[PDB]
Design a protein around this ligand. Structure first.
Ligand code: 72V
Ligand code: 72V
Lengths: 187, 187
């Protein structure tokens, strides 16, 4: 059975951090649902790229659970994710079932907001470190991609391929990740 | 005056190769128009990400000329660009005025289709080399980003940041490109 990914798309999400994981995961044969936080309508990302979600989050939640829940970054995107009771419920459910949770850039700050994965080693964008570390509930890492417990984190647009390929490896194995990687012309 | 970029978005475009340059160029303060080849409606990219263009190509052409015309890749996207008389006209005009033309992955094959920049050194995705080189009208390069005459080319999703930053450097200078690069957390 194909693995399934939920990518939660809020206004102000970093569009590179949204599209790179969606694309790379689809290349791996993962069934990806791009779910609009606010509903079914198109989402204005941080740099004004407008993306049409596959579904509302409300509708996508009904089709859960998912093998991974992915939280893109962007400060304002992450803030919207952090303020959402629906996001809280999804992440709590995912944590309770020991499923993978993946977040990049400022995205991991939504884990703090929703009290998810406390005690884990995490990374973030450098500019989001202080927010993430308020209260010392996580252990900070400068690795480009970090994985600890349920929790897979990464730093920025320039770590998005690595982040996406780490998701692929977690879900579909190292050989699939390598096969998906080769045609991308990565460094 | 801000520099201006036209990014031509066709069905089957590689969404990473579309979004990374749009985003990075906007970070550099370039005014970017994402122009829909087919009209104003949303565009289904190669991996099913749906992007809403800023304008139709028909409308964006009226607001030309641009400091750069950017052609994303994706085989079917590039084919659509190659078949378009509107694209032909835009690229011919840009070449005639000695403006920058930038293409990635299979995107450079549209330059061949429209007889643009013959004699230039170019790169492409490895799988698009034979198509690009039919007739020996260009000189092939394996560099991740290649620039020769008017013509800036690059290889794939994994060279998209380098490609975008090379555009930024060409338009806004090396220091702006460096400033935009640093917060991205690139390797
Ligand atoms: C991330 O996308 C993000 O969330 N943050 C705070 C950031 C800063 C600079 C560049 C990228 C990003
Ligand atoms: C490019 O986006 C493209 O145009 N081509 C042919 C390709 C092949 C593999 C991976 C990326 C790409």
């Amino acid at each position: 059975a194909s693995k399934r990914a939920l990518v939660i798309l809020a206004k102000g999400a970093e569009e590179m951090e949204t599209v790179i994981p969606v694309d790379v995961m689809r290349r791996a044969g993962i069934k990806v649902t791009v779910a609009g936080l606010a509903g079914k309508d198109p989402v204005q990302c941080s740099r004004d790229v407008v993306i049409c979600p596959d579904a509302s989050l409300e509708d996508a939640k009904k089709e859960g659970p998912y093998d991974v829940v992915v939280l893109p970054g962007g400060n304002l995107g992450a803030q919207n994710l952090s303020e959402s009771a629906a996001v809280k419920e999804i992440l709590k459910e995912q944590e309770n079932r020991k499923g993978l949770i993946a977040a990049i850039c400022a995205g991991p700050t939504a884990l703090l907001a929703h009290e998810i994965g406390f005690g884990s080693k995490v990374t973030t964008h450098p500019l989001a470190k202080d927010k993430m570390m308020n209260g010392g509930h996580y252990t900070y890492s400068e690795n480009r991609v970090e994985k600890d417990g349920l929790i897979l984190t990464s730093r920025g647009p320039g770590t998005s391929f690595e982040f996406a390929l780490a998701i692929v490896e977690a879900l579909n194995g190292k050989e699939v990740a390598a096969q998906v990687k080769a045609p991308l012309v990565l460094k």
